[PDB]
């Protein structure tokens, strides 16, 4: 549960991201692979990718962050109110994909990261409250989908 002000901070945070997309999820993406490598072994299309050279070369690593970050902006735009959007990627994650809750907690984490990482000292303590509660309430409505499922 965010209050205006808090929403008002992720929604200013969220316009550094969408200056530039593809660099932010790319830098996302590297993050988590490199720091948690048993994320990259969920990705048939990104397992061969042994380094992080061949990481930020992959054109096609840089299309998937696109996509990642379209589909978490889009649900951060509702300000909460993403049970449509949230739904089909919650089911998504637990049954096709595969996806334990603890890599949406990595993945979070990793945001903060490249935001401190791209934009030092212009990432203050309270965006980082805000942003961190957003993702907070984005993983754990997706953690009540993953118990109606069962999925572990
Ligand atoms: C911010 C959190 C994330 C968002 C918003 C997100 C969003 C998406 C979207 C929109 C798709 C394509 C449509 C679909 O299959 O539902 C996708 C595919 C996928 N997601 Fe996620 N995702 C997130 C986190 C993760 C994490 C942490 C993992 C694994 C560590 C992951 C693994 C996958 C995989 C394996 C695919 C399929 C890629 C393919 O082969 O094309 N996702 N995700």
Redesign the pocket.
């Given at each position: 549960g965010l209050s205006d002000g808090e929403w008002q901070q992720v929604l200013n945070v969220w316009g550094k991201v969408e200056a530039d997309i593809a660099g932010h999820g790319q830098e996302?993406l590297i993050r988590?692979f490199t720091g948690?490598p048993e994320?990259?072994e969920?990705?048939?299309?990104?397992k061969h990718l042994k380094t992080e050279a061949e990481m930020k070369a992959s054109e096609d690593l840089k299309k998937?962050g696109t996509?990642?970050?379209?589909?978490?902006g889009g649900?951060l735009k509702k300000k909460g109110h993403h049970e449509a959007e949230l739904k089909?990627?919650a089911?998504?994650?637990a049954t096709?994909?595969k996806?334990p809750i603890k890599?949406?907690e990595?993945?979070?984490d990793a945001?903060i990261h490249v935001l401190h990482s791209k934009h030092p000292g212009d990432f203050g303590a309270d965006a980082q409250g805000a942003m961190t509660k957003a993702?907070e309430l984005?993983r754990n409505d997706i953690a009540a989908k993953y118990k109606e499922l069962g999925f572990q």
């Open positions: 996302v988590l948690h994320t990259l969920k990705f048939d299309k990104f998937h996509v990642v970050l379209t589909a978490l649900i089909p990627l089911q998504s994650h096709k994909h996806i890599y949406l990595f993945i979070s945001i993702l984005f």
